[PDB]
Design a protein around this nucleic acid. Structure first.
Ligand SMILES: [Mg+2]
Ligand SMILES: [Mg+2]
Ligand SMILES: [Mg+2]
Ligand SMILES: [Mg+2]
Ligand SMILES: [Mg+2]
Ligand SMILES: [Mg+2]
Ligand SMILES: [Mg+2]
Ligand SMILES: [Mg+2]
Ligand SMILES: [Mg+2]
Lengths: 170, 293, 159, 205
RNA sequence: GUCUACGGCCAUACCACCCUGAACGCGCCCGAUCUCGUCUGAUCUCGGAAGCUAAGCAGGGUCGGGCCUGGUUAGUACUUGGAUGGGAGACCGCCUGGGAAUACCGGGUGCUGUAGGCUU
RNA sequence: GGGCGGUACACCUGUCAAACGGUAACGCAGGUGUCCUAAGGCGAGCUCAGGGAGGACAGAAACCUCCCGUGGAGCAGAAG
RNA sequence: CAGUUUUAUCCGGUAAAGCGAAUGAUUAGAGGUCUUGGGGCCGAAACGAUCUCAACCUAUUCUCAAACUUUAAAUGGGUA
């Protein structure tokens, strides 16, 4: 017995593209995520103005999105399809999450268009067990318990158990 | 290599909060407005009307406040319904209005104001702010106290509100968050509210679940069909709530058979045993130490 | 030439006690205050509305007025030689009861209990409080041993 | 030099430390507060001779420099070059003031900082030397000379402790022996019977 | 022994790691037609009930930290009054009466004044 | 002493103030003669600085995500 | 009625004390992995190995405070 409320599923899947420039670069990099998921993305903006980069305070820069459910497994298969299933040791966080960023969005299966270009983006997977929306509901918050929290090795033998993804030392 | 932030000098300068905020059941900033009486009133109590939502149950209580903790006068649970003949879908809007009615005429059957101050008998949906009667003993009022549930537009709490009001209680309200409010043009219908009261939105599943598929009609209607309830039995009970079974409002709390008084919780390990454990562990570690090496 | 502000020299006075910051507890408010009761005054830094001036922090007076969220109060003050009888309007947070009158209201009742009783008995029971008299002659028994001889210590440099 | 030390000798004013308020302060001359082979163990310098002050006064830090030097030059001769350990157990924090009369005059005469100084109570340690037990008759001689730089009157006292600790003479070896105290270079740590058990097992095993 | 709304300064009630949890209960959990909302039915809102002990939950545990009270430090430090009492001065003794605080060593780890349903 | 030089000539904040309050000097360290249709008045909803572990160009420092997080941030200006 | 005392009651942050407690100032060693460097050093590289000086974390230690404080007296201030 493994107490069926001890599985390992996906809570959420994150995505962002940071370009560091407003105008047309941002609003054209907002059509890759829309084709990619099916929903509208959310612009982020600056925090404090830096004289060297070329950003101003509260100037719009990046674009990010959040994915749920059975939609994340599909995009994550096009991911580990791209990375040919050879992640490494230090991609895994100490709390139980990983992430990685692809170099070009041609690998996601999207056809090139010459008024766009290529924008590099990022993936970040967030794991889960039943009871995790305890630490966010308004009424009776409570916390987890720390017999029920995920380590680094359990996640690595979930990735290796599921997608047969090898992990190399390095 | 980073500094531990839960030091001795973190626990020394750490004032704890209140117990009901640590157990997060309450709000003291929302209570302080609701509960105090103005000082020129001199021990005139301030009635509030608690409504609690639980994932299988509804609770409707009435209480003023004292320094010894706020004190109940009249409680109304939502699992005393299957006395009367509503057994399934115990927590919908319908039973939220049926409980507030059972509370209402319970209190009127504990004060002696039954025949006077009837309230609404029919079920229409419009404003029935109950006015007082001259010469007779005056009306009864009680202010609402919802709590930690966002009172948006369409909550089950207000069904209990409309039930205690139409029962006869005089509660201040305004028809802006009731099922039937148009957020673009600001008018209000009654029949949409009475379509939401008796159980017609609950009923419509006798189509969207009874036709399109038949496998999910047994995946999520497994207690209507067990108790043999069709989707046309959306029926009146309120003459049974009205008539005479508030002469047992309390159900006559049942007598108590004498219990064995047996215990199910292992008691506290004493001092002269915690002073004995570490003598066992020091002698076991020295007799499993010097023997080995 | 110091200043004449409202809150001069009240760094430590309107401050909250240590580890007692935060929310005002709810049994401060719902206590009842009649007219005629005797009240001491303690300031507070949370609710800035209705503070007393800094020269009343500790005085004690009685009530003459009750309001919606405040009571009027009559106190006494000493200005350059004379004594003025002045009245204020104080919110509830800055106010407590005084327990000074209570051991008198427990001794009026105890005396009238000690008087209604044993008057019909023709008994003469003492009523006046009498101060601590000089104590009585009494024996001390040293069963057996002798008193323990003390010795003043010889000096040595401790440090 | 500056004004002689007859002026700033009695503790008179309130303490006026270098802070957010008093800037414009020159630095003290003393910068090293101990010397010798300070990389010592607590098991090879048993002796500990103090210099107890007596009178409530102020000691300048140029005296806390020209006393350290005069005790070092004699200690290199007699006891050797690695047979001792000197500490100076004060730190000058109080700041003393001055007024320059260069025609304005006496109006507006709040002073400027001149130097630094250290307050001294009665029965307070100034200097302390720990050394081997064989060299006791050369520390009275070193401090008899250090007495000619400070003003006032103070006394030389041989402690009843062991080294620079707060523990007694004989008690120290029976307690180290029953593993209550642990050597840590110049000091020692105390083990109570209060903490949890795994340190106990990490001490016995 | 539990659920609802609390009281008092709100820690004897907190934090960290372990463990057992009978019955009624609370909860994670099943889902998106119902004008409840979000980029996202996760959160909020609603309609529900196949399935199970991590849960601010509940109770006990740690030669635990923390806290709460008691001894030591100590009649020490300090101090209201007084003296043709010392001392070159700094400052220290005396009579008279009041009188602390750390380190260090011990014991305790929620009472429930509380009203309604409930180990019954 | 006058003069040249200053504002202690109306106000507020800490300190001197000798454990209520009051209390001086050309005694200290400092500031003001304004600013705002929101930075005023109600209501819902959120929680900050810093720190860790990660992630394509990304570096000391852009954005995202997870955990610890009794105020270490902020509240137009001086300081409580 | 009182320039006073007793018995009950609340108020105050001074002298003392304290940094192994916050806010600031400060000396010397001890164990660690490098948390990062400037150089030795073998090195086509390293947190491999490095002497380390050094900062970093943990337990310890020497002294301080008018504009710093956990505690906290003596006299003293109102009431009955
Ligand atoms: Mg838990
Ligand atoms: Mg466990
Ligand atoms: Mg002076
Ligand atoms: Mg209980
Ligand atoms: Mg049984
Ligand atoms: Mg403990
Ligand atoms: Mg005074
Ligand atoms: Mg503002
Ligand atoms: Mg001081």
């Amino acid at each position: 017995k493994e107490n069926p409320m001890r599985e390992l599923r996906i809570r959420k899947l994150c995505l962002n593209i940071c370009v560091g420039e407003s105008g047309d670069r941002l609003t054209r990099a907002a059509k890759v995520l829309e084709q990619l998921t099916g929903q509208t993305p959310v612009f982020s903006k600056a925090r404090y103005t830096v004289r060297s980069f070329g950003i101003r305070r509260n100037e719009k820069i990046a674009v990010h999105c959040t994915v749920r459910g059975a939609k994340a497994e599909e995009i994550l298969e096009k991911g580990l399809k791209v990375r040919e299933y050879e992640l490494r040791k230090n991609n895994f966080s100490d709390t139980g999450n990983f992430g990685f960023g692809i170099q070009e969005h041609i690998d996601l299966g999207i056809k090139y268009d010459p008024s766009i270009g290529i924008y590099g983006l990022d993936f970040y997977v967030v794991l889960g067990r039943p009871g995790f929306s305890i630490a966010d509901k308004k009424r009776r918050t409570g916390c987890i318990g720390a017999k029920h929290r995920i380590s680094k090795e359990e996640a690595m033998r979930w990735f290796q158990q599921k997608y047969d993804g090898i992990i190399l030392p390095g | 290599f980073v500094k531990v932030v839960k030091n001795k000098a973190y626990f020394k300068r750490y004032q704890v909060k209140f117990r009901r905020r640590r157990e997060g059941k309450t709000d003291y900033y929302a209570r302080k407005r609701l509960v105090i009486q103005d000082k020129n009133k001199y021990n005139t109590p301030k009635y509030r009307m608690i409504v609690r939502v639980t994932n299988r149950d509804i609770i409707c209580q009435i209480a003023y406040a004292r320094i010894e903790g706020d004190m109940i006068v009249c409680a109304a649970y939502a699992h005393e319904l299957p006395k009367y003949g509503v057994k399934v879908g115990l927590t919908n809007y319908a039973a939220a209005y049926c409980t507030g009615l059972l509370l209402a005429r319970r209190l009127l059957n504990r004060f002696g104001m039954d025949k006077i101050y009837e309230g609404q008998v029919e079920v229409t949906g419009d404003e029935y702010n109950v006015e007082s009667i001259d010469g007779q003993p005056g009306a009864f009022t009680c202010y609402l106290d919802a709590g930690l549930a966002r009172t948006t537009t369409g909550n089950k709490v207000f069904g209990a509100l409309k039930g205690a009001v139409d029962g006869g209680l005089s509660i201040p309200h305004s028809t802006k968050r009731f099922p039937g409010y148009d957020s673009e043009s600001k008018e209000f219908n009654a029949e949409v509210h009475r379509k939401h009261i008796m159980g017609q939105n609950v009923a419509d599943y006798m189509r969207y679940l009874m036709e399109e598929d038949e496998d999910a009609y047994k995946k999520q209607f497994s207690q209507y069909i067990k108790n043999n309830v069709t989707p046309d039995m959306m029926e009146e009970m309120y003459k049974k709530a009205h008539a005479a079974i508030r002469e047992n409002p309390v159900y006559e709390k049942k007598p108590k058979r004498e219990v064995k008084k047996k215990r199910w919780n292992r008691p506290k390990m004493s001092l002269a045993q915690k002073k004995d454990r570490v003598a066992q562990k020091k002698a076991s570690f020295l007799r499993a130490q010097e023997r080995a090496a | 030439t110091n200043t004449k502000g409202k809150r001069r020299g009240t760094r430590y006075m309107f401050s909250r006690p240590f580890r007692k910051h935060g929310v005002v507890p709810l049994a401060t408010y719902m206590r009842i205050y009649k007219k005629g009761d005797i009240v001491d005054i303690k300031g507070m830094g949370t609710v800035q509305k209705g503070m007393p001036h800094k020269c009343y922090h500790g005085k004690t007076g009685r009530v003459y007025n009750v309001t919606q969220h405040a009571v009027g109060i009559v106190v006494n003050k000493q200005v350059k030689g004379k004594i003025l009888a002045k009245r204020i309007n104080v919110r509830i947070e800055h106010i407590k009861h005084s327990k000074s009158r209570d051991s008198f209201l427990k001794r009026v009742k105890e005396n009238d209990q000690k008087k209604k009783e044993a008057k019909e008995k023709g008994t003469w029971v003492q009523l006046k409080r009498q101060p601590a008299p000089p104590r009585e002659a009494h024996f001390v028994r040293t069963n057996g041993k002798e008193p323990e001889l003390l010795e003043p210590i010889p000096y040595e440099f401790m440090a | 030099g500056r004004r002689p030390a007859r002026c700033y000798r009695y503790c008179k004013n309130k303490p006026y430390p270098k802070s957010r308020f008093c800037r414009g302060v020159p630095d003290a001359k003393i910068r090293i507060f101990d010397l010798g082979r300070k990389k010592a163990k607590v098991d090879e310098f048993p002796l500990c001779g103090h210099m107890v002050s007596d009178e409530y006064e102020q000691l300048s830090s140029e005296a806390l420099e020209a006393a350290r030097i005069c005790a070092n030059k004699y200690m290199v001769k007699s006891c050797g070059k690695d047979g001792f350990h000197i500490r100076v157990r004060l730190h000058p924090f109080h700041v003393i003031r001055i007024n320059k009369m260069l025609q304005t005059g006496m109006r507006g005469a709040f002073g400027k900082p001149q130097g630094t100084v250290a307050r001294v109570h009665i029965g307070q340690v100034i200097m302390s030397i720990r050394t081997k037990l064989q060299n006791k008759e050369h520390v009275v001689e070193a401090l008899r000379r250090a007495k000619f730089k400070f003003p006032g009157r103070q006394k030389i006292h041989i402690s009843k402790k062991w080294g620079f600790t707060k523990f007694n003479a004989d008690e120290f070896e029976d307690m180290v022996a029953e593993k209550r105290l642990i050597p840590d270079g110049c000091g020692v740590k105390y083990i109570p019977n209060r903490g949890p058990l795994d340190k106990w097992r990490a001490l016995h095993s």
